[PDB]
Each structure stands twice: as C-alpha cells, then as structure tokens.
Amino acid sequence: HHHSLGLMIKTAECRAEHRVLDIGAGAGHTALAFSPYVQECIGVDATKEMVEVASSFAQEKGVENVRFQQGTAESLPFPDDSFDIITCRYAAHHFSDVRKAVREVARVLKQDGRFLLVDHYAPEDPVLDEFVNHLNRLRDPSHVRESSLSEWQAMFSANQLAYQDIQKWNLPIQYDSWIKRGGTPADREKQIITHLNHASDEARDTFCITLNQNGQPISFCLKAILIQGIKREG
C-alpha cells in the first residue's frame, strides 16, 4: 500500500513543529510514515489488540515520537483545535457512524489544519453502490459502509471542511490473495464468486472484474481516492 501512504506525505506539507493524529491507525503504518517529518504522532484504534501491535512495532522500528492508544473516531478524547494534520486511511468504511467521525475530525483539527482521508468509495450509482459494498461485507463482516463522493462532500461541507479530491485511482485486488488475507469461509466465498459472476455489465466494467473461464475470479478493482479537507469557517 505504499502509494496511498506516499501521497499523504506529499500532500500533507509537513513542518518540524506539527502534531499528527492517525484515526483507525491499525498496525500503525501511517502513523509511523509521518514520524520523521513532524513533532508527534498520536494514533487511535478501537481494538486494544491493535494498539499493542502498533506500539511494539513502533518500538521495533525504534521511533520515539509516535504513540498509540485505544479509542473510537465517533468520540475522540482530544481537545478542540489540537492537531495540524489528521490522517485516516482505509479505516472509514469500518466506522459505525462516519457522520459523527467527520464531526469529531472537524472539532479536534486546528483552523486551516488538514484532513488527509484515504479510502475506497462507492460509485454514485446506487446499484453499483450496493455491489461494491456487498462484495466487502461478504469478505470482511466488519465492513460498515463505503460512502460515496457526493456523501463525502456533503459531510465535509456540513462541517466547515473544504473538500479537495487530490487524486483518484483504481485499486487492483488479486482475488485469490484478497480472500486469504480476509480469512473468509468457503461458504461466503461461494457468495462472493456468484456475486462477481452475475455482475451487471456496468458492474464488471466499473470494477474490472477479470474471471477464469470456469467462473473462478482472477481479479477486480476498488475505487481509491485521496480527499483532502481543510478546516475553514461557517
């Protein structure tokens, strides 16, 4: 995943003196990437098991200035106007209330502070929408929703956040490995496979469905993007 991550560093326009907050931080890859360039990274993740991974991994790469902690995006501990940068990467489709999360991002971000949000997203067409969302709840039962770009813009505007699409790009997925990494049972996998085999034309177009002649999926694409948001006023 080095591309999404590099873009954020290019787009973030770091400063020696900045403080960074990585939300849904995971094994903490974003949080570490930033570390050489900013003062301090803080990262939150909901699962405690992930805080530990993150924090030991930090230690393993011996970086002093990043630290992880447990919490949720819908309720960040931190004070208002207390970060220059916030990163959120392939985590939002997991939040149980993305509306609130943005509101919190808004709160805790400083004025003219930047929100670098990377994720994949539903196309505007609701039918294509369901398609890509249903393909992912099937793979990952923890998948809440990948909101659409209209939706992201409406949320940004709703929170005095100035929306800019830095760059889109298709996310190739190699079906076979995607399944492994995701741990899915062969029950669900059969539903995934039916799903991909009965794709509308529009669907197998928009998501690059490539299949073995036996119906067995080779590959497809998610729609990745990097929105950047900047806290202005209302």
Ligand X SMILES: C[S@@+](CC[C@H](N)C(=O)[O-])C[C@H]1O[C@@H](n2cnc3c(N)ncnc32)[C@H](O)[C@@H]1O
Q: Using only C-alpha atoms, what is the Rg of the chain? A: 18
The CA distance from 228 to 117, in Å, is 6
Selected from 21, 26, 128, 133, the binder of ligand X by CB under 6 A is 26
Q: Which is nearer to ligand X, 31 or 209 (CB)?
A: 31
Does position 192 interact with ligand X (CB under 6 A)? The reply is no
Q: Which is nearer to ligand X, 44 or 209 (CB)?
A: 44
The CA distance from 229 to 47, in Å, is 26
Selected from 38, 50, 85, 209, the binder of ligand X by CB under 6 A is 50
Does position 95 interact with ligand X (CB under 6 A)? The reply is yes
Phi, psi of 203 (to 5 degrees): -75, -50
Chain position whose Cβ is nearest to ligand X: 26
Selected from 7, 14, 21, 25, the binder of ligand X by CB under 6 A is 25
Selected from 8, 32, 46, 138, the binder of ligand X by CB under 6 A is 46
Q: Which is nearer to ligand X, 33 or 209 (CB)?
A: 33
Local structure of residue 46 (DSSP, 8 states):
S
Does position 89 interact with ligand X (CB under 6 A)? The reply is yes
CB 89 within 8 A of CB 118: yes
Selected from 7, 45, 98, 104, the binder of ligand X by CB under 6 A is 45
The CA distance from 103 to 153, in Å, is 13
Q: How many residues bind ligand X (CB under 6 A)?
A: 20
Does position 72 interact with ligand X (CB under 6 A)? The reply is yes
Selected from 14, 21, 73, 227, the binder of ligand X by CB under 6 A is 73
Element (H, E) at 197: helix 186-197
Does position 47 interact with ligand X (CB under 6 A)? The reply is yes
The CA distance from 38 to 17, in Å, is 6
Does position 12 interact with ligand X (CB under 6 A)? The reply is no
* Min separation Cβ 203 and ligand X, Å: 24
Q: How many CB atoms lie within 10 A of CB 193?
A: 18
Does position 137 interact with ligand X (CB under 6 A)? The reply is no
Q: Is 202 left (phi over 0), alpha (psi -120 to 50) or beta?
A: alpha
The CA distance from 5 to 187, in Å, is 34
Chain mean position to CA 207 = 18
* Min separation Cβ 42 and ligand X, Å: 13
Which parts of this chain interact with ligand X (CB under 6 A)?
23-26, 29-30, 44-47, 50, 72-74, 89-91, 94-96
